[PDB]
Amino acid sequence: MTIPYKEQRLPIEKVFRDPVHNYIHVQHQVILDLINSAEVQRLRRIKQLGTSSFTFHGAEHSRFSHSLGVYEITRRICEIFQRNYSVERLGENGWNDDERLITLCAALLHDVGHGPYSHTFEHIFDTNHEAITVQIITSPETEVYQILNRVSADFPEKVASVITKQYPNPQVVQMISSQIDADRMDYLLRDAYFTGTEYGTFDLTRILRVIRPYKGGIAFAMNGMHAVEDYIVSRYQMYVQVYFHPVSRGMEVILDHLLHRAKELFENPEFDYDLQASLLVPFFKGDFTLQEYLKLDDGVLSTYFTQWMDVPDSILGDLAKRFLMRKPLKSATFTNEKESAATIAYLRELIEKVGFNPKYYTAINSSLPYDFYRRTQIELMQKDGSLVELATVSPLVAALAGQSQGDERFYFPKEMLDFDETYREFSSYIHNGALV
Ligand SMILES: [Cl-]
Ligand SMILES: [Zn+2]
Incomplete structure (x- = not known):
């Protein structure tokens, strides 16, 4: 017509x-x-x-x-x-x-x-x-x-x-x-x-x-x-x-740390042969196209994370495990950023002695x-x-x-609240999800 x-x-x-x-x-x-x-x-x-x-x-x-x-x-x-x-x-x-x-x-x-x-x-x-x-x-x-x-x-x-x-x-x-x-x-x-x-x-x-x-x-x-x-x-x-919500925020930290680790291994000459994540490659390289961006979705990334459990890197493999098992980092609250910076740094050393790299199993967050x-x-x-x-x-x-x-959270693995003298020392500074 x-x-x-x-x-x-x-x-x-x-x-x-x-x-x-x-x-x-x-x-x-x-x-x-x-x-x-x-x-x-x-x-x-x-x-x-x-x-x-x-x-x-x-x-x-x-x-x-x-x-x-x-x-x-x-x-x-x-x-x-x-x-x-x-x-x-x-x-x-x-x-x-x-x-x-x-x-x-x-x-x-x-x-x-x-x-x-x-x-x-x-x-x-x-x-x-x-x-x-x-x-x-x-x-x-x-x-x-x-x-x-x-x-x-x-x-x-x-x-x-x-x-x-x-x-x-x-x-x-x-x-x-x-x-x-x-x-x-x-x-x-x-x-x-x-x-x-x-x-x-x-x-x-x-x-x-x-x-x-x-x-x-x-x-x-x-x-x-x-x-x-x-x-x-x-x-x-x-x-x-x-x-x-604390546990949802603990989940964001793990994903963040997982992707960070993935990007660092990719940019490193010999730290991870090939993680098989073809759709993420343009993003790791920092040269992405609109079409490449449109090919990404939750299912695509979930597939890669599941595959990263085999990757010969303890940190990456463990984070992918924690992300897929849906277990976030536990946290505690604090007010002083400078006064409590000593306590934070201290219990970060305790996390190392046990076997957790603080750069990947710890975080400081706020909204x-x-x-x-x-x-x-x-x-x-x-x-x-x-x-x-x-x-x-x-x-x-x-x-x-x-x-x-001004909510301020300090993240760490839940396994810190469970060779046992350090765990006893760590939990001593946390009472009801708050620092001492
Ligand atoms: Cl998200
Ligand atoms: Zn909307």
């Missing part, structure tokens, strides 16, 4: 079953094609909770299922915006539905650049998922780009501009990235379910009941303050029980909460027209904003 690619609908609404949202609804051809693109399909083979998933049994949900979730919350929000908060009846403070497609695409593609065990992988190799996401969307060698380009020649650039917070419409940008966006709302609910963290679940329906657009972006009806508060508390709960402007880093609430920020009306949120925790 021809119906433009923008407006193409499915004969019948496609659906995806979901434990968090019940059903993911797909009705645009573009969205379906985006979902079926190699780039987005790759996310099925990548765990949302990287190393942290090994902390809770069964929490191996993929980044793909999270992406669909953000997409789903987003369309629920756009549907709410059109039915009762359009430009047609609110003017400048209204929502333009012509923005529906782009926000849906950005929602779904917001995490395409992640890669396996993203956070840890991101440190060892100089990669950046936010930039790769934008790269995937804007470079022609991608199925995502080819799909977007069919919407309009300038569409790939515009979708990318939403992700980088440069898109001219704030309502679109904040729906995908703010202090209370579709992205955050999804992973908090999704990670809460899979890890079984009961206190991590908040009521999404209440928040959706009060969500609203306005001139400068996205606001929430004043009366829904406590529903927003419940979201803040749930965010706090996920942070302490799941994200900054994003809600804090009003010092902007777009605040959630706003509408009274009778005007806008006020959350911490100004919520003593609870104001309390958690000023609460900053």
Whole structure:
């Protein structure tokens, strides 16, 4: 006729079953094609909770299922915006539905650049998922780009501009990235379910009941303050029980140390014949291609780690064992970085005498909460027209904003708390997961 690619609908609404949202609804051809693109399909083979998933049994949900979730919350929000908060009846403070497609695409593609065990992988190799996401969307060698380009020649650039917070419409940008966006709302609910963290679940329906657009972006009806508060508390709960949880952090250290060791053996003339990890080679060399990056996923790396147990290097072989047996390093807390630097260095010698290289079996670690402007880093609430920020009306949120925790952890093998005179000497400086 021809119906433009923008407006193409499915004969019948496609659906995806979901434990968090019940059903993911797909009705645009573009969205379906985006979902079926190699780039987005790759996310099925990548765990949302990287190393942290090994902390809770069964929490191996993929980044793909999270992406669909953000997409789903987003369309629920756009549907709410059109039915009762359009430009047609609110003017400048209204929502333009012509923005529906782009926000849906950005929602779904917001995490395409992640890669396996993203956070840890991101440190060892100089990669950046936010930039790769934008790269995937804007470079022609991608199925995502080819799909977007069919919407309009300038569409790939515009979708990318939403992700980088440069898109001219704030309502679109904040729906995908703010202090209370579709992205955050999804992973908090999704990670809460899979890890079984009961206190991590908040009521999404209440928040959706009060969500609203306005001139400068996205606001929430004043009366829904406590529903927003419940979201803040749930965010706090996920942070302490799941994200900054000690044993999940002990898992990141092991993976970090495993990859470090792998890279050092590779750069060394004769320390490891050939570790057979062809897909990691371009990364060890520091000369990687986009296509080479897209070939990587959790399954690919797990295969290599399993193979590294045979590698004639005690350190590498032992770390791969500890990673696959899902046993992280144990830890203890401390406040003084300089005053307790003597105690740390001392018990590091004790770890050597036993047979553990402190560079690989020890670590010092420390750590994003809600804090009003010092902007777009605040959630706003509408009274009778005007806008006020959350911490100004919520003593609870104001309390958690000023609460900053300088948590400092010291890692070591669990086997230190089990020729036995040294173990007795070591455990003497640790009482209830804290230094003495
Ligand atoms: Cl990770
Ligand atoms: Zn996300």
